[PDB]
Amino acid sequence: NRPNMVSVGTIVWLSSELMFFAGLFAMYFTARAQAGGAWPPEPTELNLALAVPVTLVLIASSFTCQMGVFAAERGDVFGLRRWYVITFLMGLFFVLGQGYEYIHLVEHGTTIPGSAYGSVFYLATGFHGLHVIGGLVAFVLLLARTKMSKFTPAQATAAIVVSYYWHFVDIVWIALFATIYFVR
Amino acid sequence: MHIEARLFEILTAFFALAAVVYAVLTAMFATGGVEWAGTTALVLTTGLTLITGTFFRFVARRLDTRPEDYEDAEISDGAGELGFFAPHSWWPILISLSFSTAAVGAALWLPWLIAAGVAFVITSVCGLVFEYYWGPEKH
Amino acid sequence: VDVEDVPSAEWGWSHMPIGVMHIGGLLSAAFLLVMMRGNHVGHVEDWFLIGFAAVIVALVGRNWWLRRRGWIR
Amino acid sequence: VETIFKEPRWPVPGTKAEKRTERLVAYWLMLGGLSGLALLLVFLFWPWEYQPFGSEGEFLYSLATPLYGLTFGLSILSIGIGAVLFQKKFIPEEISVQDRHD
Amino acid sequence: ADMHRVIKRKGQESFNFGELFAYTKVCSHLGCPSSLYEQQTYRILCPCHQS
Amino acid sequence: DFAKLAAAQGDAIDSRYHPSAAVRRQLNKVFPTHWSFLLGEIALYSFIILLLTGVWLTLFFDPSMAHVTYDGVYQPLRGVQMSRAYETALDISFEVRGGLFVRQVHHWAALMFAASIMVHLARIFFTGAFRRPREANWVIGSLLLILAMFEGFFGYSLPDDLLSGTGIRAALSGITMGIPVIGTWMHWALFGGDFPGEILIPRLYALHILLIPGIILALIGAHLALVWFQKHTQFPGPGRTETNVVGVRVMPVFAVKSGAFFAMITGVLGLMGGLLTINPIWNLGPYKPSQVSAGSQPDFYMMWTDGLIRLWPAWEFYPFGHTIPQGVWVAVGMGLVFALLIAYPFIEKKVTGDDAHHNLLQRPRDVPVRTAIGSMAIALYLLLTFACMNDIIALKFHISLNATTWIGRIGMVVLPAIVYFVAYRWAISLQRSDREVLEHGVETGIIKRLPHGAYVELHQPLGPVDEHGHPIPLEYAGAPLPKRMNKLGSGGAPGTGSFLFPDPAVEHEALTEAAHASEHKSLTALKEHQDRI
Amino acid sequence: VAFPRLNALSFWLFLFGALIAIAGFITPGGAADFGWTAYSPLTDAIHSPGAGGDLWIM
Amino acid sequence: QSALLRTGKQLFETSCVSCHGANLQGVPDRGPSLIGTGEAAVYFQVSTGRMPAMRGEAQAPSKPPHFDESQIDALGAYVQANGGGPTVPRDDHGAVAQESLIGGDVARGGDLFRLNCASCHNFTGKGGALSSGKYAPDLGDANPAQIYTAMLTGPQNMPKFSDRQLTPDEKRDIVAYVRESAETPSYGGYGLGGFGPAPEGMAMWIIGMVAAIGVAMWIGSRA
Amino acid sequence: WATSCPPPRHNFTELPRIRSERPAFELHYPHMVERMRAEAHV
Ligand SMILES: CCCCCCCCCCCCCCCC(=O)OC[C@H]1O[C@H](O[C@@H]2[C@H](O)[C@@H](O)[C@H](O)[C@@H](O[C@H]3O[C@H](CO)[C@@H](O)[C@H](O)[C@@H]3O)[C@@H]2OP(=O)(O)OC[C@@H](COC(=O)CCCCCCCC[C@H](C)CCCCCCCC)OC(=O)CCCCCCCCCCCCCCC)[C@@H](O)[C@@H](O)[C@@H]1O
Ligand SMILES: CC(C)=CCC/C(C)=C/CC/C(C)=C/CC/C(C)=C/CC/C(C)=C/CC/C(C)=C/CC/C(C)=C/CC/C(C)=C\CC/C(C)=C/CC1=C(C)C(=O)c2ccccc2C1=O
Ligand SMILES: CC(C)=CCC/C(C)=C/CC/C(C)=C/CC/C(C)=C/CC/C(C)=C\CC/C(C)=C/CC/C(C)=C/CC/C(C)=C/CC/C(C)=C/CC1=C(C)C(=O)c2ccccc2C1=O
Ligand code: HEC
Ligand code: HEM
Ligand code: HEM
Ligand SMILES: CCCCCCCCCCCCCC(=O)O[C@H](COC(=O)CCCCCCCCCCC)COP(=O)(O)O
Ligand code: FES
């Protein structure tokens, strides 16, 4: 009969977090306008054979995260744990996939000090990867709390607000993925 | 809670108008074309009010009038338990100390101090989250 | 000490004489003042010693005066 | 000495939790055995001789001592973890009072 | 250019060969080698106890 | 088969030694289970590991000062003149399989041993375990801490490298020779002439491998025997009195826990020995009096002595054609600290006047003056230790080296005063926090709005209540009081099953009923015992 | 307030964050000297190499 | 080459007159004279990024360079033409020598470094603090040419070791030890910074004691 | 201004009827309630 206080606090903070990514987006666009015709410039060669499967995994993690919310709203703690463990594994795969992309980009001459494109690319995607890592920590902390006490409505609220952050992270990546790999 | 999001929708419309006007006015008769830094900030400033306003719009249409949303409600209408509010906790000062340790390490570029700070933050945040959920000791 | 000031007054050592803290503070300031004797050629440190010694002396004097007048016990 | 409290950890027999806890203790002991065998194998076959700077074997040599501590440390630590778990999950909980007569 | 700032010790006014000076490397405090010679400030720093 | 052999051997042992009454007494002895009681075992386990690794090291170490030419595999030191002590120390870490691991484990074990004593000493001081009839047990331990300090100091001086050789030259030589009247005669008797001489390392080797460890082992045996027959002090609580010991018997609970703790302590030291580089002597080179590197810090247990040297001003006296150097201040101050540490229980019993038998510990919050004094001493020790690292701190943290010396100098007098005042207020404030629970109950954190608009917080009484509903105020009993509802069991249990799949409902109900039945009986047994006595 | 513990966290984050920036005055180089506006490239490591500016940022 | 000289002066005018003067005589209380410092001093001071300096303090720190290799050579030639002085070693192709400066006797370089450098830079070039706000920076980033020029020119508080006090072969041996002691991995695990007991005691207290006390909590009981 | 100085731990031992932006003024001056509604508009 009353709005969820934790949900309102999380959504309010999630809106503010978007302005942090606004600054990173401004840096990428400012450097893109000064590229001069090459964006990305040589020797940076983005490959979609790896980014696309990595992006699809993160998108699929949102669906399983939503499934855990349905279990949490249903009062099924075991269903919530199964879906959030699966979500954590795919979220971890996203971090490993991004890092594996980072290793090959560095070997081919795309680094933060190497070029202006490397600076904006790594800051924008790296800070998002830090947000993904923070989301994985939230999953572990929330799941550890599931083994401490009985499944209460306040505990179910904590599961919902964590999924809000995960959905926010996934949506931001879609903007980053479309802006970097398609709007060149 | 119909007033709360009406505040954000009003801000959303103005931010959307300013973002569109600034982008168009910088595209024409402005050196360098579209000024990307301000346009990006204005566009995503509209996003901030849009997400909060849309959420408040969905919450408002679900639940009926609250006692604080009534134009003639009585004090006795709000009787009952409000919720959980933490009485005391020394974890927040530990979280800030943990975060300040990482910032000092990042300021002076000491990777060992950064690693210690990150580990301290995780432990401090874990204590705050688990403070009111730890069970009794089992022996 | 009374249980109103220290609730666990009967469970352990809970009282330290005020004379010990007052004399210790005066000796605290005196040791700071004698440390200006040395091989250092700068005087930035000397002013820091003087300031800390003055603060300690002022605190000791304020506490002693307030206890003498009876405003604090 | 008077034992005022003494109860078994699993009064209800035939429970899945008891079998699950039994495997948890065995898993830590199995890890200790695997790490102890690994310590035996790395000490005998890992390249341990010093290699000069800029040589091909320098990197493998630099991991010789680190591998000794990782395998030795994890082995006995896992055994200790399993022993603690066995006491806290299978050894009956007891409270005993002894007169000091001091 | 810094030779005018040199102050001589009694009984040691002629111990230097022009602008060359020789001082013991052993610190007078506890015997550590005080060899942190700063050329501009002309300060000899002992790494053991900061003399 | 296996049962008959045990019975046959048991009868054979009993027929020849009749150790039945005595062994049963050792199996039935009760030890309290508090976590802080295990702090003395960490130091004991570290010493055992030191003995095991130390014996291994003696099979390869040549403690000679004779100068030789290096012929080992370490290329950056090929041909460099060095002593045999530095020669074999490189041989252990390079020419013997596992020698580097053993040498690192030994030195990490020393660091844990020194750190364990300081932490274990803190509990003894703050909880009042030093009081009678345990004054002599405190005194024996204080000697053990001093012996450990010098044993560790001699330990890393054996390799005769540049870093430790510099530490020997200052601490062992200059301070000793600066002592008035007999100071130079002590230097000649210990070095066999002038520094460095030719007999220092062999003599230090003997002192470090036989004499000091032999004295430590004898004192440890007396420590364990005293803390094995005088019994162990326990914290106040339900059923705990001045004449009983509450806990678990040795067999099998305490033996398993102690043995498992030994395995875990060894693993931590084994991992650190093989995951963190400690004392890389090959990077420092052999000791030469003409060489000197920056950051000449000793081991952390010997830093406060070095910090005292760095901080004390250059105050010297020259009476009648003689010299009293600055090292005399440190030498006298070092002795004063040891004298105060050893004789503290008698000082307190003289000041407080309390000379009664004590078997129940005191919570540190309940003794604000001693807690403030101990916090003051800890702050002084920490500042002295960090003053030894002032040059290292100055480089890494961008602080003037002159500033760090004066910060430590002024802080040496100001910071202990601040810490004493803060700790004294903090200790009393925790007493007030404990009281608030007693007359009002545990704050559940749930806010309720009354029909007339009052905001009240629901409280959980710890005892009987009034007819109005307010709990009867309870009297403090020296025991910790709950402050979180989740610690009282209000959170319940998640549900019996694996992390991903639930167990059948009947099994969960049976398990939770058995658990609730077991906890109630345990509480009832303690309550019935407390009521009887 | 809605989040009593988050409210307390803000105070300490604010107190320790302010102390970090002010702590530049104890460094030999000093604190930040590029103005509170911190205009670029004056704040670049080339033009502001000191640790006082870094403490100001963090 | 007249092209290299006028390029160096043209770079000098808008970057180095405010503190060093238009004729390289130095500006009192702002900067010393650059006459006789040589090309080696300019190469070190600019390639290490130490110059142009930004303010007066205890010690000018290193930072990203303000000029590239071609501009450094032009600046060095302009200063070299005014008073002469030492020059940076060069290879056959005329580039700044880096690999050819690595000496073949690292054992000799180690003893020389411990006699002449360890006091200010530490056993393994990790850096060390000086009197008042000054310090000997860590040596793990300098290339062999930078180390050679630092030994030649003696920057700020470091002694100006001449080619007679330390012969070119001795200098090459020292930089060989400096370069190898920075690129050699630790043998007993993580290096902990290489500063000695001070990180070692910190690591023990924060890792082993925390684990030991944390394990004691798990095995033991409260109250 | 409708609570004690200082307010209790939970800020309120009671709450008045809220009908405008001056609840404390209405609580302390009930006779002025009619006047404020009548004179609110110029
Ligand atoms: C149960 C408990 C028991 C367990 C306890 C065990 C814990 C230990 C764990 C770690 C073990 C690792 C083993 C591998 C060892 C190894 O193979 O080693 C590689 C090399 O690595 C470093 O080379 C760097 C470069 O590669 C070189 O290229 C470069 O040259 C070099 O630079 C030096 O040399 C230059 C000149 O050459 C100088 O110019 C320069 O300045 C410097 O000196 C670099 O070194 P450096 O910067 O030192 O650090 C760089 C470090 C970054 O730091 C760090 O690790 C910090 C973190 C650890 C350090 C120790 C802790 C610090 C504590 C402090 C007290 C904090 C302060 C707090 C204050 C509060 C209190 C105060 C009051 O990055 C990394 O490795 C990244 C790796 C991170 C891995 C994390 C581990 C994951 C654990 C997860 C466990 C899960 C378990 C779950 C179970 C269920 C040097 O070491 C080399 O020698 C070494 O060879
Ligand atoms: C290169 C290379 C590899 C070389 C390295 C060399 C090296 C470092 C070797 C170390 C090897 C080590 C240390 C191995 C042994 C590890 C170990 C402890 C074994 C594992 C045990 C284990 C996993 C347990 C499972 C089952 C089991 C056997 C249970 C425990 C059995 C027993 C009898 C325990 C042994 C532990 C022990 C020594 C003590 C228990 C007995 C008693 C009564 C302790 C004595 C005692 C204690 C401990 C007190 O707490 C105490 C407190 C107050 C007053 C007095 C006392 C007192 O006298
Ligand atoms: C005489 C004497 C005692 C000197 C000390 C004087 C002094 C001013 C000390 C500290 C000064 C500092 C920390 C300067 C930085 C500027 C700054 C932010 C100031 C503090 C501001 C303030 C008080 C408010 C913020 C809140 C707050 C309290 C946070 C600060 C927390 C931090 C980061 C403190 C750490 C300071 C400190 C002394 C710790 C050093 C510990 C040691 C011994 C480190 C040795 C060490 C080193 C050096 C390694 O290289 C290494 C490499 C790899 C692994 C490990 C290590 C390692 O541990
Ligand atoms: C103390 C008096 C020193 C002695 C002896 C040596 N060095 Fe040094 N060095 C010292 C300082 C204060 C500085 C910084 C000066 C600057 O102008 O900023 C240096 C610098 C170096 C460098 C440059 C390092 C860089 O930042 O990459 C190198 C390579 C260097 N020093 C090496 C070096 C060698 C090989 C020495 C023995 C001959 C030596 N230094 C002695 C302080 C002192
Ligand atoms: C070699 C170092 C030491 C070892 C191995 C050691 C070992 C132990 C052990 C195992 C115990 C029993 C467990 C415990 O209460 O923690 C104990 C108790 C005790 N130790 Fe230590 N100890 C050492 C040093 C010290 C020091 C430095 C002091 C005090 C200065 C001290 C004084 C005591 C006292 C008074 C007890 C009484 C036990 C009690 O009443 O709880 N010991 N010691
Ligand atoms: C309290 C007990 C002890 C402490 C604190 C201690 C401490 C130390 C330390 C810190 C070192 C230097 C380690 C290193 O070189 O890296 C050392 C060296 C040594 N210790 Fe011990 N030690 C102890 C007991 C013993 C015992 C009992 C022996 C022999 C039985 C022993 C034999 C040695 C040997 C041979 C060395 C030198 C060989 C080497 O440098 O590696 N120690 N000791
Ligand atoms: C290296 C091995 C050294 C010897 C270790 C011996 C270990 C096996 C002990 C077997 C005990 C037999 C118990 C029994 O029920 O048989 C009993 C043997 O008779 C005894 O009472 C023996 C008393 C002396 C036992 C002292 C042993 C101390 C060992 C401590 C171990 C922690 C048979 O009695 P019963 O008929 O069952 O009543
Ligand atoms: S040894 Fe030179 S200062 Fe003490």
- Report DSSP letters for E31-51, one per residue: S-B--EEETTTTEEE-TTT--
Burial of H101 (0-12, 13-18, 19+ CB in 10 A): buried
Expressed in angstroms and rounded, the spacing between residue C26 Cα and the centre of ligand 5 is: 38
Identify the DSSP state of H25: S
List of residues 6+ apart from G36 with CB closer than 8 A: none
Task: Name the residue type at position D70.
Answer: L
CA distance F490 to chain A (A): 9
Q: Are D32 and D75 in contact (CB under 8 A)?
A: yes
Chains that touch H (3 or more CB pairs under 8 A): B, D, E, F, G
List of residues 6+ apart from F169 with CB closer than 8 A: E30, E31, E32, F195, F196, F289
Task: Name the residue type at position D62.
Answer: S
Spatial separation of the C-alpha atoms in residues F72 and F78, rounded to whole Å: 7
Identify the DSSP state of F181: T
Q: Within 6 Å (CB) of ligand 7, which residues are found?
A: F 6-7, 9-11, 13-14, 19-20, 23
**Long-range pairs of G54-57 with CB within 8 A, sequence gap ≥ 24:** G54/B107, G54/B108, G54/B109, G55/B104, G55/B107, G55/B108, G55/G20, G55/G21, G55/G23, G55/G24, G55/G27, G55/G31, G56/G21, G56/G24, G56/G31, G56/G32, G57/B107
For G28, nearest residue in chain F (alpha carbons)? F400
**Nearest-CA neighbor of F122 among F236, F226, F43?**
F43
Q: Within 6 Å (CB) of ligand 2, which residues are found?
A: D 72, 76, 79-80, 83; F 41, 49, 52-53, 98, 101-102, 105, 224, 227-228, 250, 255-256, 258-260, 262-263, 266
Binding residues of G for Fe(II)-heme a: 36
CA dihedral for F389, F390, F392, F397, sign (positive or negative): positive
Task: Tell me, rounded to whole angstroms, the distance of Cα F194 from its chain centroid.
Answer: 37
Q: Are B62 and A54 in contact (CB under 8 A)?
A: no
**Nearest-CA neighbor of F160 among F251, F332, F291, F352?**
F291
Task: Name the residue type at position F244.
Answer: N
- H64 vs G29, G33, G46: nearest CB: G46
Q: Are B112 and H193 in contact (CB under 8 A)?
A: yes
CB–CB contact B55 A145 (8 Å): no
Ramachandran sector of residue F183 (left: φ over 0; alpha: ψ -120 to 50; beta: rest): alpha
Identify the DSSP state of F171: I
- Cα of first residue to Cα of last residue in chain A, in angstroms, is 48
For H136, nearest residue in chain F (alpha carbons)? F395
**Nearest-CA neighbor of H79 among H29, H37, H129, H127?**
H37
Q: Which residue CA neighbors atom 36 of ligand 7 most closely?
A: F7
Contacts of B87 in chain I (CB under 8 A): none
CA atoms lying within 13 Å on the CB side of residue F35: 14
Q: Are strands F244-249 and D93-99 parallel, antiparallel or unpaired?
A: antiparallel
Spatial separation of the C-alpha atoms in residues F270 and F267, rounded to whole Å: 5
Identify the DSSP state of H204: I
Spatial separation of the C-alpha atoms in residues F509 and F279, rounded to whole Å: 58
Spatial separation of the C-alpha atoms in residues A118 and A106, rounded to whole Å: 9
Q: Are F256 and F135 in contact (CB under 8 A)?
A: no
Which helix (H) or strand (E) covers residue F82, if one does? strand F81-83
Burial of D45 (0-12, 13-18, 19+ CB in 10 A): exposed
Spatial separation of the C-alpha atoms in residues H217 and F38, rounded to whole Å: 9
CA atoms lying within 13 Å on the CB side of residue I33: 12
Which helix (H) or strand (E) covers residue B111, if one does? helix B111-130
**Nearest-CA neighbor of F136 among F148, F146, F144, F147?**
F144
Contacts of F407 in chain E (CB under 8 A): none
Total structural domains in chain C? Answer: 1
**Cis bond leading into I30, ω under 30°?**
no
State how far the alpha carbon of H9 is from the alpha carbons of H38, H74, H85, H149, in Å: 15, 8, 17, 22
Contacts of B138 in chain F (CB under 8 A): none
Domains of chain A (ranges plus CATH)? 5-181 (1.20.120.80)
Q: How many helices (H) and strands (E) does chain B have?
A: 4, 1
**Nearest-CA neighbor of F74 among D56, D49, H196, H122?**
D49
Expressed in angstroms and rounded, the spacing between residue F223 Cα and the centre of ligand 5 is: 7
Q: Are strands F244-249 and F67-69 parallel, antiparallel or unpaired?
A: unpaired
List of residues 6+ apart from H23 with CB closer than 8 A: H82
Q: Are H212 and F108 in contact (CB under 8 A)?
A: no
Q: Are strands B80-84 and F442-449 parallel, antiparallel or unpaired?
A: antiparallel
**Cis bond leading into E47, ω under 30°?**
no
* Alpha-carbon dihedral F86, F89, F93, F99, rounded to 10 degrees: 180
CB–CB contact I15 B74 (8 Å): no
Residue whose token pair is 């579209």: B34
Q: How was this structure determined?
A: cryo-EM
List the structure tokens of A88: 């954590």
State how far the alpha carbon of F75 is from the alpha carbons of D51, F86, F361, H139, in Å: 9, 15, 59, 21
Q: Within 6 Å (CB) of ligand 4, which residues are found?
A: E 36-38; H 48, 50, 60, 62, 113, 116-117, 119-121, 136-137, 139, 141-142, 146-147, 150-151, 155-159, 161, 174, 178
